Design an enzyme around this catalytic site. Structure first.
Site, short mmCIF file in Angstrom:
data_model
loop_
_atom_site.label_atom_id
_atom_site.label_comp_id
_atom_site.label_asym_id
_atom_site.label_seq_id
_atom_site.Cartn_x
_atom_site.Cartn_y
_atom_site.Cartn_z
N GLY A 72 0.83 -1.22 0.00
CA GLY A 72 0.00 0.00 0.00
C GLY A 72 0.85 1.24 0.00
N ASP A 86 -11.24 10.10 9.27
CA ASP A 86 -11.14 9.63 7.87
C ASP A 86 -11.75 8.25 7.70
OD1 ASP A 86 -10.59 9.87 5.15
OD2 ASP A 86 -8.47 9.32 5.40
C1 LIG Z 1 -3.12 -1.39 3.43
N1 LIG Z 1 -2.92 -1.69 4.85
C2 LIG Z 1 -2.86 -0.75 5.89
BR1 LIG Z 1 -3.08 1.10 5.71
C3 LIG Z 1 -2.68 -1.39 7.07
C4 LIG Z 1 -2.60 -0.75 8.33
N2 LIG Z 1 -2.54 -0.27 9.38
C5 LIG Z 1 -2.62 -2.80 6.79
C6 LIG Z 1 -2.42 -3.97 7.55
N3 LIG Z 1 -2.27 -3.93 8.87
N4 LIG Z 1 -2.42 -5.15 6.92
C7 LIG Z 1 -2.57 -5.15 5.58
N5 LIG Z 1 -2.74 -4.12 4.75
C8 LIG Z 1 -2.76 -2.95 5.39
#
Ligand SMILES: Cn1c(Br)c(C#N)c2c(N)ncnc21
EC number: 2.7.11.23
Length: 331
Positions: free
Chosen positions: A20, A141
């Site tokens: 991300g 948000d």
């Molecule tokens: C995209 N994403 C975010 Br923002 C997280 C946080 N905090 C997260 C996470 N903890 N596990 C997988 N993808 C995730």
């Protein structure tokens, strides 16, 4: 910051892949050799602005962690944080995909009223937890992208991204929330409180069931016009106290307010949530006709709850405890 797969940090974390990206920096999948588990590491950009805001985010997550209660487990767990190559790094449990992806996977036709209810109950529980007096945390948000499944096989969810969050009385920005999920009080430039998250939730739950955003404004003026289509002109007592009322509205001699009109919306309050939900017409686009758990009675409870979450008045808007006692959640 270029982070290669295979990169080892501090004889503890092996970086696997990019999960991300955001305004704040990036989230990577990493293997923690100490706990022997996979974790998500949020890597904040090496710029003062991003660092200082992420320091608030860490403080609010640590504050939440030190409150062991049955209501705390709808929030993503911050495991720890460290500084590395001048990037603040936040280590979270791994979660699964987000509720926007869930909707994209339905081709934006929405999930069942029963799955919507399960999401609603968890999110109301999370908002009850943030409203704990010693926390008084405003997420600021809430949106489908900021709600993650715990497990792709299951319907458990957690809220992520406390990146904009503030305690009550610790407001920084007037302009907050993602526009589709932005409360009337924030559109109107008013001092905001925890009720702005309940507005976002109301918006989110309608979208989870219809597949589409309730109020998809292209800018603040379009946003407020889309809200007025469904809910009517905001009450005078609110508009009379709003710094930005005259962005959207005009006051007349007799103390009444009306939309400011621009060049050619449905008339105020005539886009009925009753018809958006399809309460008497087989649900959104009639796609739930004859399905179990989508009776008129089921729909009316849902409609009632949502209209309480979308009260213009943040004073009277339903609060998390009372939302949890609503008939929508009764067996
Ligand atoms: C995209 N994403 C975010 Br923002 C997280 C946080 N905090 C997260 C996470 N903890 N596990 C997988 N993808 C995730």
């Amino acid at each position: 910051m270029i982070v290669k797969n295979g990169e080892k940090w501090m004889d503890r974390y092996e970086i696997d892949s990019l999960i991300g990206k955001g305004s704040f920096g990036q989230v990577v999948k990493a293997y923690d050799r100490v706990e022997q588990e996979w974790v998500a590491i949020k890597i904040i950009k090496n710029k003062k602005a991003f660092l200082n805001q992420a320091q608030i985010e860490v403080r609010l997550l640590e504050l939440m962690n030190k409150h062991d209660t049955e209501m705390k487990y709808y929030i993503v767990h911050l495991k720890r944080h460290f500084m590395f190559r001048n990037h603040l790094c936040l280590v979270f449990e791994m979660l699964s995909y987000n509720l926007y992806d869930l909707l994209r996977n339905t081709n934006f036709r929405g999930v069942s009223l029963n799955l919507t209810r399960k999401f609603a109950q968890q999110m109301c529980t999370a908002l009850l937890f943030l409203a704990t007096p010693e926390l008084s945390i405003i997420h600021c948000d809430l949106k489908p992208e900021n709600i993650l499944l715990c497990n792709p096989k299951r319907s458990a969810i957690k809220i992520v991204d406390f990146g904009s969050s503030c305690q009550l009385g610790q407001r920084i920005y007037q302009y907050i929330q993602s526009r589709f999920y932005r409360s009337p009080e924030v559109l109107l430039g008013m001092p905001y409180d925890l009720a702005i998250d309940m507005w976002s939730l109301g918006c989110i739950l309608v979208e989870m069931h219809t597949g589409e955003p309730l109020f998809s404004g292209a800018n603040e003026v379009d946003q407020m016009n889309k809200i007025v289509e469904v809910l009517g002109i905001p009450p005078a007592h609110i508009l009379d106290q709003a710094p930005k009322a005259r962005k959207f509205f005009e006051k007349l001699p007799d103390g009444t307010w009306n939309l400011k009109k621009t060049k050619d919306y449905k008339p105020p309050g005539t886009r009925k949530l009753h018809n958006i939900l399809g309460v008497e017409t087989g649900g959104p686009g009639g796609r739930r006709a004859g399905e179990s758990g989508h009776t008129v009675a089921d729909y009316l409870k849902f409609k009632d709850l949502i209209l309480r979450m979308l009260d213009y008045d943040p004073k009277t808007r339903i609060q998390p405890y009372y939302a949890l006692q609503h008939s929508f959640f009764k067996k």
